Ligand binder design. Structure first.
Ligand SMILES: [Zn+2]
Length: 18
């Protein structure tokens, strides 16, 4: 719950759109 990488409250890290 919440993006490991990027902080943002949405999506999982692994293929995050960052
Ligand atoms: Zn992210």
């Amino acid at each position: 719950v919440k993006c490991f990488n990027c902080g943002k409250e949405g999506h999982i890290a692994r293929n995050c759109r960052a």
